[PDB]
Design a protein around this ligand. Sequence first.
Ligand SMILES: [Zn+2]
Ligand SMILES: [Zn+2]
Ligand SMILES: [Zn+2]
Ligand SMILES: [Zn+2]
Lengths: 121, 122, 121, 122
Amino acid sequence: VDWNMLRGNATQAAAGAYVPYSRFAVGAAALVDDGRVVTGCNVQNVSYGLTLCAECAVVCALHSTGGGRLLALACVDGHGSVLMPCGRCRQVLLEHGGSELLIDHPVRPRRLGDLLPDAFG
Amino acid sequence: DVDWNMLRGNATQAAAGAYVPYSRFAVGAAALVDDGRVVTGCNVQNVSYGLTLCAECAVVCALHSTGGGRLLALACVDGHGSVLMPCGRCRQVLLEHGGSELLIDHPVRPRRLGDLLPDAFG
Amino acid sequence: VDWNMLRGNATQAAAGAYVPYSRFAVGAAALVDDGRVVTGCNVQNVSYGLTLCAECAVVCALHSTGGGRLLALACVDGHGSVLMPCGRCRQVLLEHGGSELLIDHPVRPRRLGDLLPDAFG
Amino acid sequence: DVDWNMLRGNATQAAAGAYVPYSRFAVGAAALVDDGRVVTGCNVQNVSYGLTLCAECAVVCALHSTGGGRLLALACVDGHGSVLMPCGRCRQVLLEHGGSELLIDHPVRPRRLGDLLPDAFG
Ligand SMILES: [Zn+2]
Ligand SMILES: [Zn+2]
Ligand SMILES: [Zn+2]
Ligand SMILES: [Zn+2]
């Protein structure tokens, strides 16, 4: 896994964030099991509860570009700092990457199964 | 100015991407953005049903991943290519990115989002 | 429908709002078909997309206190001003009140079916 | 200090309220708040699956409708009374109102929410 590449593509993805309500831009990038890279950014709504996370955008991209399984994902804020997915996104990503999906972390990337142990499903 | 045949067809193709193991109700959507490009989405269900993403939500994500802009028209269809009206959540999400004048495909005549979501919270 | 009563109970409900991220408190109150009144307030989350609307809280209350159908609902901000439900909530409320559910409005209360015409379902 | 028998039973009773016509998978939840009261919730599905509310979300709504406070312990169960682990969304929602030390019922030994959602976004 070229983490520098994934981090770069997530950082570039953060540029597209629609965040007029908090200004907290988030980008995400994932390697798919066919080698391709899909990306996404967050999209807020005036009704905060309808906001879509970057990682949710990544999973939409995954299925809109031929499906498959996610192998690795990096999520960053608009400054390029690595972020941990919210719990909603951990559940969403599990559906498409499983417990062995790697998630970027500033120290060492972690298995999703360790970030969401004994997951509902 | 909108090629609805093109949009409805693209939405129809988009629906084959749907991840819908729980209901098997595929949905695809396609929209024309104000620079002339078309973006598509399909729905993506989750084992926790409440984390399911609509096709129209996927469209809005694709919008912002591909340069942003404003939506001018959108078509939403099921797996059989039958035109669908967006759910209330998608009406509100779409209003954020195309406003009241966003046109929504409809079997008889496209409708303004403003008429599908009047007196919108904002 | 005693709208003054429903507006009062919604206003009182707004006091419980958990809104550290925008400070926009919302309360809601509904008359159920057995005569009882259920209430709710909004609950934000650090991940904005996990925020729960007041009207969502009302529907949870409905089912946690014996189920039934909603006949009328009033939604107000923390100042007691009537608010129109977001689209997500219109879809949610439709499930439990139908097209004929009345929703408070400053001029005249409206049928939900008019606020969400040709609804998905 | 937590009566888990009481919590699990209350969650079990709460699950009979569930609105679940699409999956028929009822869920009930009950939690002890820091003033000693117990709040309950059940899941509520929607025809647009993504608008489904979890029982744990219902609990957090009930928390704030009944005076607010902090959650100390929560039990979540299905319609048969079998203990369930919350979904990722509910883990994040619960973290907001009980923090890492919130205890989650489990068939062998209650777990800290911090262990079910480590390195949480915040
Ligand atoms: Zn997230
Ligand atoms: Zn929708
Ligand atoms: Zn709402
Ligand atoms: Zn849940």
